[PDB]
Amino acid sequence: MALQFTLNQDAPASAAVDCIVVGAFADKTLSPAAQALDSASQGRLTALLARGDVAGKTGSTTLLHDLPGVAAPRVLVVGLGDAGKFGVAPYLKAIGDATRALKTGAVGTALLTLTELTVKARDAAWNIRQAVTVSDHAAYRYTATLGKKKVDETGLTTLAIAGDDARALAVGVATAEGVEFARELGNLPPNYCTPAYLADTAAAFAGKFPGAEAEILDEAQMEALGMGSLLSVARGSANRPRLIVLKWNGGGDARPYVLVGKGITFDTGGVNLKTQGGIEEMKYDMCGGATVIGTFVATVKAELPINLVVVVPAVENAIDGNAYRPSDVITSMSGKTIEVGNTDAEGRLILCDALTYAERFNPEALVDVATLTGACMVALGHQTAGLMSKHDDLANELLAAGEHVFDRAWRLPLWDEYQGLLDSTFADVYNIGGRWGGAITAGCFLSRFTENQRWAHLDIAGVASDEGKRGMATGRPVGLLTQWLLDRAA
Amino acid sequence: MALQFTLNQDAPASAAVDCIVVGAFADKTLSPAAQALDSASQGRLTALLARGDVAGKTGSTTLLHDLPGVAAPRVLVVGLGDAGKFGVAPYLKAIGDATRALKTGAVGTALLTLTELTVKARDAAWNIRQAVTVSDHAAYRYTATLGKKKVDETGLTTLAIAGDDARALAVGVATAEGVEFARELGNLPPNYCTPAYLADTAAAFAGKFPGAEAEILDEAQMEALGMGSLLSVARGSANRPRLIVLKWNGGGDARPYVLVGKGITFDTGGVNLKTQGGIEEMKYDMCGGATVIGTFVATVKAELPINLVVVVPAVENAIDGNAYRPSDVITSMSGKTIEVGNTDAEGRLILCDALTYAERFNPEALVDVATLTGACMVALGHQTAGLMSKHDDLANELLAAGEHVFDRAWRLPLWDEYQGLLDSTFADVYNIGGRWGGAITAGCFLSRFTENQRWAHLDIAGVASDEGKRGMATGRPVGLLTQWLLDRAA
Amino acid sequence: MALQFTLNQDAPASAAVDCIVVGAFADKTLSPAAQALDSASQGRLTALLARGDVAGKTGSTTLLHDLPGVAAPRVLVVGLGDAGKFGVAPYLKAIGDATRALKTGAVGTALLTLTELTVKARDAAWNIRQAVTVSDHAAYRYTATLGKKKVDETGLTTLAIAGDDARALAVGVATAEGVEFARELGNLPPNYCTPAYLADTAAAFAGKFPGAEAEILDEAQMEALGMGSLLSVARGSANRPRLIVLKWNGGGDARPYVLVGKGITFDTGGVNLKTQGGIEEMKYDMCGGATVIGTFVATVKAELPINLVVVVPAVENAIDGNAYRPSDVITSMSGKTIEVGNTDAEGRLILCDALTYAERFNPEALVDVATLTGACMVALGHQTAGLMSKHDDLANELLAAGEHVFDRAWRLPLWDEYQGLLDSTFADVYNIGGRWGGAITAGCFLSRFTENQRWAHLDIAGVASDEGKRGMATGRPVGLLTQWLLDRAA
Amino acid sequence: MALQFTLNQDAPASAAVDCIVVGAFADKTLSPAAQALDSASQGRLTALLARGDVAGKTGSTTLLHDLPGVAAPRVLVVGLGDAGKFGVAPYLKAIGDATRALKTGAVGTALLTLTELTVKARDAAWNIRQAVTVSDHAAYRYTATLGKKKVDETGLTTLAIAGDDARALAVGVATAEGVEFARELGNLPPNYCTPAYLADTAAAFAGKFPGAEAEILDEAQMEALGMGSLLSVARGSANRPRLIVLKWNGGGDARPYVLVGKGITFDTGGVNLKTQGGIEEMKYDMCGGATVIGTFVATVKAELPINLVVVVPAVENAIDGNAYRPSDVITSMSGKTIEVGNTDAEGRLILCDALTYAERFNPEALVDVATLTGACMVALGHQTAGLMSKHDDLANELLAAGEHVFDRAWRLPLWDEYQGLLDSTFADVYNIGGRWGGAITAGCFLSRFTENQRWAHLDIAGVASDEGKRGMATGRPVGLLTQWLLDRAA
Ligand SMILES: [Ca+2]
Ligand SMILES: [Zn+2]
Ligand SMILES: [Zn+2]
Ligand SMILES: [Zn+2]
Ligand SMILES: [Zn+2]
Ligand SMILES: [Zn+2]
Ligand SMILES: [Zn+2]
Ligand SMILES: [Zn+2]
Ligand SMILES: [Zn+2]
């Protein structure tokens, strides 16, 4: 992991760490712990606020050396913005600002005092869990496939969190591990993160934890199950597919929560080749997979007293002399025939089969997570995931979770009047809907396969990764899904 | 108006009209009026139902000639689908079917008995209102700019509506007149429907009704008001702009409802010329204007007890040697400067000045209606309007209205984390937000100008007209808007 | 005219000119005049044929200096190909070869003996006519808008044509003057060849010849005639339009032949701007006009005994703040309204009013000539003009003409089952028919306006000019057209 | 100017300013002034260096508060990189870093000691000049067309520069004023920076300085001079063109240096409209003009002993119903006719007339500066200007200048075997050379007009501005140009 975390009950002026992180608002008001430091230093902070050397606005950090009265030789004061605007987002931002300021340089250990602040509509435990997740996220560094490049080794390695809720720290660490796991898999280049590598990785995790389990299916096994839709998409690739099935037995004999994630390890588009631009971003097209796996890792580490099953169709969509074609009609596991209007709308073609397969687990709730559509990105941007369901209660449960940890989704409708967009002359249903309403129509396609299920669909195409060669997997929506499971476990 | 309407309370078998319109369900059960006719004819309908000659599935009709016992020489039986699934949609589809079946041919007068059928969660008044709007909508024929083309003379002219609520009929007739007005304006070629013409049509209507009032501004007048954003869009075109302001004073003393409709009479895209297809559909880019004007017409003819102001900026966005250019920084009426990233995002540039304008009226609710974004089409389809607001109560008022009359909208978020996409180095604000979230950031742009207002935004790009050379303006969202105002008048 | 012509009946060996032009075939056999020269030189040609110095294959020439016995200091021997395969094409290619070989250099005067060669299915008159047109065509040099560029002064100025039909020479010379006129007009940059200039050039020619007459209309005059389709195209451009009407009264009392030529002097595409390449070739979009004017010139100079009217709508199709826009509905002269699906299908919109106009002349045959469609190029290539008509007899008259002079056309059907592609909801007719059949539906469009007429349409888009920055106007189809009129005068 | 400058010779520890700026290297060694401060503070810096709190790697800074012994309450230590690798680039990056670090916040006055550091192959004068230009460059904030947007008030206003060459400071300050002028002009939106405005700004500057002179020509005047190429570009736009001619007579009797800057104030591409992206960056297409004007400002304020003439054709290239069209043949001032292959290759068409114009001044060197070609960007990047000339000595003068001040250029060949690419059938010259060699053939085009001249061409398309909505005009190549003129004044 990027950082290690402890809890800490010291007086801020006595803490034996390389640096104390405190806060100041835009009107120059000091966070409580900042006040303790101001006292110990006999008004040195107030003197610097007065002089305008310590800024309180959003994004400001100021690093001060050897305040008198303070055991730690450093104090970082982070701006918290306008006090009357303080809440969830300023708090998360403030915490990320602190870590980004300490990421490189002389500070190995710091004390995060910001957890003491009231965040409206949130408790002390939440303040701790978010301290861990946000600061761990901000310290992430990818190195798996550097060869000769040396990276910087200095800076923050351990963060002491002001507080004493051990359980909250533990759930925050477990979450951060899930997040990191998902971002590593997302980030790995497609020639390393193949379907085989993803299944092995997930299995080697399962196998270290008493009560976690993995079952990996291969193409022969999937053929025997009738997963013909999934197999059409996979056929072109020299990298052969896997069905990754992960179980956590924390809920005794209760029915399980079932997550189904799209694990297209790379998407060329197939014969409908991606020629418009951004084909390089397509290692992120397994983030639904990475993300439900990350959630499994968090759930298992936090020992959540629930039953969780995670299903990930791990498939590569390659162009090839034996690749499926547009206008092909393929037989899904459910027996429905699908007409492939476009081979690059193949996520839903591996998901439909996994969702059918998941019926065997008798899900309490069934939620698929997928980088499905450019349409959703047009609809909601990188900011927010698309959510679709025919069950209001489930939809609201997932919305509430996203809102709670600020990893937001927004519902889109599955109105009947959208359904005829998927009409076909040659098969039961057409896999695409036309120029308009594509996020919704992909959802409608999925829903053909989930009629007897309490089901929801997260389109995560915008939230899962950033654009450009410097962009990374964000780890979203591991935040939302882990919180959803915490809610189910409470 | 394409049809005449009357209420009619005659017994079905005695009605003296050219055709009686009755219903049958997919399971062979007959509407009450169908029964009366069956019984008057001593089981002829039941006989034709058995043999299979009268279908009751959705979208089917049967024209029967000279049933013994029935004064009307014809009976039209409309299929109602599974009695199980009856409700809003099947009801409306049936009215439309009935009119389509009679539109051309021997029938002039017909009695519509279908209003008798119970629609779950809708009253008798709604059955009547909807019977008039859907019939009239289906009867529409465009003729304004045909020349030598002989058009079809036969068919439905008068529809008697079974029932006995004269206020319901009057309101339906008022709404349908509004819808028709909006559709005629949207349908007219842009060489006829210039900004000047759109201003005259509306003023002329306003001048015929006591309590209604019109004021038309020209460019000198808008110059004097400082509407520099609006005038920048307008500059390149030979068809000079107008500001159309309509007032209805049916609410005495009360703060008014204010509708602001986008009246781009044609959109070349300007210097950012539309080169990628669809340019020929930009005669519908004034449908924002067409439909708030329609709603005005409906409010006036229905004599609703409210104050209603309707502001329509009317501008043609033309490419020319004096066209505003991308990277220009234009001064809006509010004094905010706008960097023009793209001349084709010009709707919002005429609305933002109209919105500032509209503030003079101290509105109870401020609602803009615009064919704003391709993004909203990708998001919501032709099916559903995009709705945006910072006031939940106002948003819910509009959603419930559209939902009542099946002229639907869906909310999209206006969260802060989207605002940054509108940053500018050379002006207060950039007029476009980049590739993703296009409908939202357009909504965000508008919000810069309505911060003090109880305001909502309706992106009507998908909903306002149909694609291709035979698609016409829909009249949407006059239905939503008028039902919204009816709720305020209740 | 680039060359001077005379008939010449001198014996080859005595002709006092700078070069005698003779033929040899691929099998070494000599043209009759070649023989005379061989014999005058006591077997020098035969000696140079044996050694292989005189090739007789297609496209080869040999310049020989000072053959004993021959008054002319030079002999040019042109290759004629296999005597087996001799005919129209090899004959013409040989004349062209001879001129190309002499175009630059020491030769001023030459005797062309090649006219002696028998061309299967062609008379001696055709050999002579063709010797003048092909030579002159090959001699053309464009100079009008060069400035500082020094041009090459040496080379052929005068061609003596072996033979003794003075009417044949006079007709060839007349045709070549017409061809040259058409090529100069087509070649001129569109800033020089505006509609105004094209009108003046033609009027000026008409005014020099008794029995010839010109009338030029301006926009007020066309306004008054109701040519609202034509004027809609014209509106956007600063170079104001003209209607050029030329009359030749060589047929006394008879109904006239009427040619209608498309005179688009430049085509930006208008609001439907040409963005996809080739815009720089739209100076050739008046070649319809150039070539009917050429044919006029030929008819007059040849003094053909027929009445000939030539109508040229002259319009620049410009993009501007007052340009007609797509979806406009414009009123044509015939009273039919036209929906403008695309401003770049504007040729037919100027022709359709010119065609209605032309009805006043009560024509014997009404033929339009236009660079109408890319579709026709895809259909027929640069090689061959598209021909369309509802009158077989007229179609055959034009095919036979083009076939006689190797200026070829090919018929395309105008069947009814194509007419539906031009439907419109907002007007009597839509101006474009969609993706397929583009040349046909353009032909169909025009036919709406010529129903009472013995009419044909010639799409000359491929045939009228050559691609790329050194390709020029061909002069085609002046050859076809003039031969057609010669047949009517016979 | 964004900052005030003074020389300052105070001992570092006694300087009464808000912040002293010192350097440390990646290996922990301290700049001389850093040492003085360390020593005044009895080893505080050395202590903070050991603990790792003061980084010396490239791009790092550290703000230290109230070091005992130092009058200034703050010390900023700037990282200098490996002492091994120190030189031009690390020196400049360090000055920029220092200003960026102080731009916003509590510091108003600071002493820049960094000028003390030896830069291999550069004198003390260059250290000072560069300290002023890089600091001022980094301090720039654009504000001209902000409206309601509140901007950040705190931060650096005055920079004291350690050292004692007042001529060096004065020249730096002069250059920075020129750079700023050029950047303001480039940055201004094209609706403010019209050709008229650009002419007034320059004339107004010229009129404030004795020995400086401005003359502005309008279209009638350019008409009279026969600048028909320039005026063809200009025709379509409502913003009428200007010829700006600035003279500085600091060299008495001598032949002048003449700079010709391309002043396209916006470029739509014209009829060859920019449809393929980037159109919004064409406000930078007058940077050729902006930067020769900047250089003028620098030459005048620095009072260089040379004659300097600066000619700027100022033209907006607009699409309109009177826009020149592709295939037009236009008559240049030199009398050469030009075939317009593409209206978007219009820069060279305004320069070629300005160049002919410029011949009146009998120049010692004639240098054009233009944002000419995308080709040059493909060739050289944003990093480096394309340089072209037929005179090696002049080329070397400019390369050495750019190399001295790190405002770099690179030569591209103007060989004859490239000239043929500009052939034309309809004019003396074609204005574009096809797909390859685009920067070279543009250079070749210009050369047709400067054959009698000691002339060079600088393609500044990559170098003049930064990409995207927050990229600004760089000011480049004012640095190169001014250093070039300094070398001529030496
Ligand atoms: Ca104009
Ligand atoms: Zn795909
Ligand atoms: Zn995919
Ligand atoms: Zn637009
Ligand atoms: Zn618009
Ligand atoms: Zn065209
Ligand atoms: Zn044309
Ligand atoms: Zn250009
Ligand atoms: Zn340019």
Side-chain angles (χ1 to χ4, degrees), chain A residues 307-327:
Chain A
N307 284 336
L308 175 73
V309 173
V310 155
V311 187
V312 183
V315 161
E316 181 173 79
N317 188 29
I319 185 170
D320 186 58
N322 196 14
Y324 83 140
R325 287 147 295 248
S327 94

Side-chain angles (χ1 to χ4, degrees), chain A residues 71 96 130 134 147-148 154 217-218 229 247 262 270 297 305 408 417:
Chain A
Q130 293 303 105
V134 175
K148 303 297 205 198
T154 66
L217 306 195
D218 61 25
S229 176
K247 336 209 222 327
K262 178 179 155 183
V297 165
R408 294 154 305 341
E417 52 269 37

Side-chain angles (χ1 to χ4, degrees), chain B residues 87-97 100 126 130-131 134 405-406:
Chain B
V88 172
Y91 181 62
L92 308 177
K93 159 69 173 168
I95 306 302
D97 289 340
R100 278 173 234 115
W126 179 98
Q130 230 57 219
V134 174
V405 307
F406 210 64

Side-chain angles (χ1 to χ4, degrees), chain A residues 93-438:
Chain A
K93 163 68 167 151
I95 277 141
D97 286 341
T99 298
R100 283 184 286 275
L102 302 177
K103 201 180 149 65
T104 288
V107 176
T109 309
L111 167 65
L112 187 69
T113 71
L114 311 178
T115 47
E116 79 190 337
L117 293 170
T118 291
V119 182
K120 303 231 203 84
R122 293 305 177 282
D123 67 3
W126 182 99
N127 273 25
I128 297 164
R129 287 179 29 228
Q130 293 303 105
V132 173
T133 49
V134 175
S135 62
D136 191 69
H137 189 277
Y140 177 79
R141 244 264 157 183
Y142 176 82
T143 66
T145 57
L146 307 182
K148 303 297 205 198
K149 203 199 274 186
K150 287 308 155 213
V151 58
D152 173 283
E153 308 302 327
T154 66
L156 182 70
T157 75
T158 148
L159 203 57
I161 306 301
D164 71 346
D165 192 331
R167 178 46 183 174
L169 190 82
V171 166
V173 167
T175 306
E177 284 177 70
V179 170
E180 211 178 285
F181 211 98
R183 291 172 80 193
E184 275 302 298
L185 293 171
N187 287 340
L188 275 164
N191 53 320
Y192 283 83
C193 188
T194 58
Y197 173 88
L198 197 62
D200 293 2
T201 293
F205 176 86
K208 279 161 211 177
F209 292 96
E213 274 170 58
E215 187 187 351
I216 304 323
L217 306 195
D218 61 25
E219 60 184 314
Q221 291 170 298
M222 287 190 274
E223 184 63 61
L225 286 154
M227 307 193 72
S229 176
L230 183 155
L231 293 168
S232 302
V233 176
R235 186 174 64 251
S237 171
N239 291 306
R240 302 314 307 142
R242 299 286 190 277
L243 191 72
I244 128 93
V245 176
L246 298 183
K247 336 209 222 327
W248 166 251
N249 305 294
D253 62 24
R255 282 161 70 178
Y257 298 89
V258 188
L259 289 187
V260 176
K262 178 179 155 183
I264 288 293
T265 54
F266 191 71
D267 188 18
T268 65
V271 356
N272 286 287
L273 190 64
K274 289 172 190 308
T275 68
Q276 303 295 60
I279 190 162
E280 347 82 51
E281 322 271 7
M282 297 286 151
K283 77 177 158 173
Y284 304 116
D285 221 37
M286 45 63 71
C287 287
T291 257
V292 299
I293 290 173
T295 309
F296 189 79
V297 165
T299 294
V300 163
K301 280 318 214 76
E303 270 154 34
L304 296 184
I306 58 151
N307 284 336
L308 175 73
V309 173
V310 155
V311 187
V312 183
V315 161
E316 181 173 79
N317 188 29
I319 185 170
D320 186 58
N322 196 14
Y324 83 140
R325 287 147 295 248
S327 94
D328 272 5
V329 175
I330 72 200
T331 298
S332 65
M333 174 177 196
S334 61
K336 278 182 279 278
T337 60
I338 305 159
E339 187 172 7
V340 181
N342 194 118
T343 54
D344 191 17
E346 91 299 340
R348 69 197 68 188
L349 302 183
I350 76 174
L351 291 170
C352 59
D353 277 359
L355 284 157
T356 296
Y357 173 93
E359 297 191 302
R360 76 198 45 222
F361 301 115
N362 186 20
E364 176 54 36
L366 182 64
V367 181
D368 75 76
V369 185
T371 47
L372 259 215
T373 66
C376 193
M377 293 200 267
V378 175
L380 296 162
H382 296 295
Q383 286 76 191
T384 317
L387 168 63
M388 282 147 261
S389 183
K390 280 178 183 162
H391 288 68
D392 290 344
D393 53 325
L394 177 56
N396 290 337
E397 288 179 10
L398 297 151
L399 283 171
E403 214 68 43
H404 196 72
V405 289
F406 199 69
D407 180 10
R408 294 154 305 341
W410 182 263
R411 187 171 184 191
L412 298 171
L414 295 168
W415 300 159
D416 285 352
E417 52 269 37
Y418 290 109
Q419 295 281 176
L421 290 161
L422 306 170
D423 291 357
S424 168
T425 303
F426 306 104
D428 296 338
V429 56
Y430 208 70
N431 82 325
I432 56 179
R435 296 164 78 206
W436 320 119

Side-chain angles (χ1 to χ4, degrees), chain D residues 235-289:
Chain D
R235 198 168 62 243
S237 164
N239 290 306
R240 304 310 301 133
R242 305 279 189 287
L243 193 73
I244 305 173
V245 173
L246 309 177
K247 317 195 43 143
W248 163 253
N249 174 38
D253 6 84
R255 284 151 60 103
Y257 304 88
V258 186
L259 303 180
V260 177
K262 173 202 166 162
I264 293 289
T265 57
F266 192 72
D267 190 15
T268 72
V271 168
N272 284 286
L273 185 72
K274 282 163 195 292
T275 59
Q276 284 151 70
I279 191 154
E280 74 289 350
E281 265 133 19
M282 301 309 290
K283 92 192 169 159
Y284 299 120
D285 224 15
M286 47 60 75
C287 291

Side-chain angles (χ1 to χ4, degrees), chain D residues 415-450:
Chain D
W415 298 336
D416 295 349
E417 42 269 23
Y418 288 101
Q419 296 283 350
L421 265 17
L422 296 170
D423 296 348
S424 176
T425 303
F426 305 94
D428 305 332
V429 76
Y430 209 83
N431 84 321
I432 53 165
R435 297 221 283 159
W436 322 108
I440 292 168
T441 58
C444 289
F445 180 90
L446 291 180
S447 82
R448 303 303 175 84
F449 297 84
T450 62

Side-chain angles (χ1 to χ4, degrees), chain A residues 28 48-57 60-62, chain D residues 3 18-19 63 65 74 76 98-110 139 141 151-158:
Chain A
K28 290 150 198 142
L48 299 146
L49 263 317
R51 214 205 280 152
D53 277 321
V54 170
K57 68 146 200 176
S60 288
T61 50
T62 312
Chain D
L3 297 171
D18 315 322
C19 180
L63 182 69
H65 299 265
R74 305 159 202 101
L76 185 76
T99 293
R100 278 173 234 115
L102 305 168
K103 205 193 161 180
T104 284
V107 175
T109 317
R141 299 160 182 151
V151 81
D152 197 289
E153 294 303 275
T154 54
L156 195 60
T157 63
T158 310

